[PDB]
Motif scaffolding. Sequence first.
Motif, PDB file in Angstrom:
ATOM      1  N   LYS A   1       0.771  -1.231   0.000  1.00  0.00           N
ATOM      2  CA  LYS A   1       0.000   0.000   0.000  1.00  0.00           C
ATOM      3  C   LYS A   1       0.797   1.273   0.000  1.00  0.00           C
ATOM      4  N   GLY A   2       1.575   1.503   0.994  1.00  0.00           N
ATOM      5  CA  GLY A   2       2.222   2.757   1.211  1.00  0.00           C
ATOM      6  C   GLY A   2       3.456   3.029   0.356  1.00  0.00           C
ATOM      7  N   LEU A   3       3.822   2.048  -0.505  1.00  0.00           N
ATOM      8  CA  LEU A   3       4.995   2.208  -1.346  1.00  0.00           C
ATOM      9  C   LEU A   3       4.645   2.343  -2.840  1.00  0.00           C
ATOM     10  N   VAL A   4       3.468   1.933  -3.265  1.00  0.00           N
ATOM     11  CA  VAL A   4       3.167   1.831  -4.702  1.00  0.00           C
ATOM     12  C   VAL A   4       3.233   3.220  -5.351  1.00  0.00           C
ATOM     13  N   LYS A   5       2.607   4.228  -4.745  1.00  0.00           N
ATOM     14  CA  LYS A   5       2.576   5.536  -5.397  1.00  0.00           C
ATOM     15  C   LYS A   5       3.961   6.085  -5.567  1.00  0.00           C
ATOM     16  N   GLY A   6       4.787   5.991  -4.521  1.00  0.00           N
ATOM     17  CA  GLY A   6       6.131   6.511  -4.621  1.00  0.00           C
ATOM     18  C   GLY A   6       6.972   5.781  -5.644  1.00  0.00           C
TER      19      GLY A   6
END
Length: 313
Positions: A86-91
């Motif tokens: 979750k918290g890594l995909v956008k970056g």
Amino acid sequence: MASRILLNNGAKMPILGLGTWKSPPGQVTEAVKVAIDVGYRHIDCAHVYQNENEVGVAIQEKLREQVVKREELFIVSKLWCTYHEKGLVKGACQKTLSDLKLDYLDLYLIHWPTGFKPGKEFFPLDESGNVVPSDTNILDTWAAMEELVDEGLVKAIGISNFNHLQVEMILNKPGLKYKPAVNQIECHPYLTQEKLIQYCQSKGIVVTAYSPLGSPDRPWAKPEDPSLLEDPRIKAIAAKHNKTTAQVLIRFPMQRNLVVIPKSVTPERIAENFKVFDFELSSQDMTTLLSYNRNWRVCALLSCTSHKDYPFH
Ligand SMILES: NC(=O)C1=CN([C@@H]2O[C@H](COP(=O)(O)OP(=O)(O)OC[C@H]3O[C@@H](n4cnc5c(N)ncnc54)[C@H](OP(=O)(O)O)[C@@H]3O)[C@@H](O)[C@H]2O)C=CC1
Ligand SMILES: O=C(O)COc1cc(F)ccc1C(=S)NCc1ccc(Br)cc1F
């Protein structure tokens, strides 16, 4: 033949693209510049290939030169396995965008179905050499991909190296918002993929064939391995058509309604591989090429075979 295929997001994708895995960083900017100059409109990229900055220099220069417009390019990249969180995909997507000098990708793929422990290493290993998994599954990773569409970072999302059951999982996801547009898989006469292709095509997913020339530059090649480019049966078909063996190997997937992404950093070959729209393989040629299947993969990796989601057997 028509140069683009319609995706299930309503956009059109060029059926021939330039591959960039193994393209050295000191050569790939020129390779992509040449490719665009000679007609390529689709570049296949990935963060793990470690050359997106240099690919991006080429794209940006050709856009600045007004050789092409951004809308005419179809740029593909892939989310690496250590960013299935979750918290890594956008970056991860944004790093690729920043490197490629883009404000959106045409297509963003889950590179492999397997998530690995996040960190600096692309293949985190335990002390016995097994990859260290992430607990995050393909469905939660897919939801993260869907968010990228909804944020405007990517126009299409898809998958790569997903087996039949993994594609089906995606399609059967509760609350699925966007179907995968593409499944990018290894495919060539020695690994013809008839079963997975028919499944994906039946579901409206476009298949992209990677390693269409058998990846002769793969780092784990062995001298005894089969060689598509040197197979005299394929050379004979090429000779009959007054084309190169590579041109036959590229045209083959095109006539199966696949997208194909041969890699080269050699300017003459980049041009040769594009000159595949003015000849047709017969049905007999096609069936003959299909007959060469031996279930042989370029892309497999022993360290990852125990991961719960490793796709191959
Ligand atoms: N999603 C995934 O997991 C994967 C995606 N891919 C993608 O698919 C692309 C293509 O697959 P790849 O494995 O690179 O291998 P390919 O099957 O495209 O083969 C590339 C090799 O073929 C050579 N070659 C290219 N054109 C010719 C020609 N006309 N005559 C003779 N030799 C030629 C190249 O040499 P040279 O460059 O020296 O000219 C290079 O050594 C990758 O670059 C990557 O973009 C590949 C593997 C996995
Ligand atoms: O992967 C590519 O696009 C091209 O290949 C690679 C490209 C890279 F930049 C780094 C590693 C690979 C390898 S070793 N890929 C094979 C591989 C990786 C992960 C899993 Br799960 C299985 C597997 F078979």
